[model samples]
Target: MTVPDEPVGFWVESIPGNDHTLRLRWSETKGAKYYEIYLVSDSTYKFIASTDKLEYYVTNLSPNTKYCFALRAVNELGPSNFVTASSTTDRG
Candidate 1:
């Protein structure tokens, strides 16, 4: 059984050409296996990406738009509730 932890420490960095990426760092917890990524727009949520790894890059997003990100721990019991973070893209 996997227990979900608090939201991990992460950083959002800007890149060239109106691009950005999210980097998350978390300590390995017992029973932790994988993670899922969720995005919220207009108060509605859509699953953007999921990976067994710890990092995800969101590209081709609308410029000057705000996006909310949430993560969940996954195990045999499936995904836990999301631990969330959010950011907006550069207006310029």
Candidate 2:
């Protein structure tokens, strides 16, 4: 795959088993070898995980808390623009 020039779109979903769990999704880049995932917390952006697929599952989050997530397409050429999304965990 050719290295992507920019990261595309992003979305988020809540898992049923836990109010603190979530699933993140994004558009696939043309040549992306993997994606870098980031979590925005405490006014800081921290690297959380990496995946080759277009979706990722996050767990152990704070309940009823607002969370922001960002992703960047990565390849040999480097990384693309960061795509972001935000969602609040269920109060239950």
Candidate 3:
């Protein structure tokens, strides 16, 4: 994934236990208002979540699994380039 337009920051973090909540964060820009999250599976990728704040917690993910993630900035026009991030959940 690429960070189109101005430089924007984004990230993903792993969460443990039955609650598979991954924390996501991004830097805010002038035109940028929100962000979108995507999951990349073996076959295809799909939209997972979107948030207006700088951070989000995604739940209901399987434990002890590796999931590929990506983010994109959104403005009035459309979404910007997707920034890539990944992490594996703990077995706990």
| lDDT ranking of the models | 2, 3, 1
Best by lDDT: 2
> Which of 2 and 3 is ahead in lDDT?
2
Which residue ranges in model 3 land beyond 4 Å of their true spot?
Answer: 1-7, 16-19
lDDT, candidate 1, 30-58, per-residue tens: 45577776776676778877677666777
Model 3: lDDT of residue 75: 74
Which of the two candidates, 1 or 2, achieves a greater lDDT against the reference? 2
For candidate 2, give the lDDT of residue 23.
Answer: 89
lDDT of each: 0.63, 0.82, 0.72
After TM-score superposition, the amount by which residue 17's alpha carbon in candidate 2 deviates from its true location, in angstroms, is 5.0
Model 1 whole-model lDDT (C-alpha atoms): 0.63
Q: Which stretches of candidate 1 lie over 4 Å from their true place?
A: 3-7, 10-13, 20-29
Question: lDDT for model 2, on a 0 to 1 scale?
Answer: 0.82
The sequence of per-residue lDDT tens digits that candidate 2 reaches over residues 1-92 is 45575666689777665788888988877878899999977768899899998888888898887789888888998888777888888777
lDDT of 3 at 14: 78
Could you give candidate 3's per-residue lDDT for residues 1-91 as a string of tens digits? 3333542566777765644767777777556667778898884779988777778777778887887777777777877876777777768
Model 3 scores worst on lDDT over the 10 consecutive residues at 1-10
TM-score of 3: 0.79
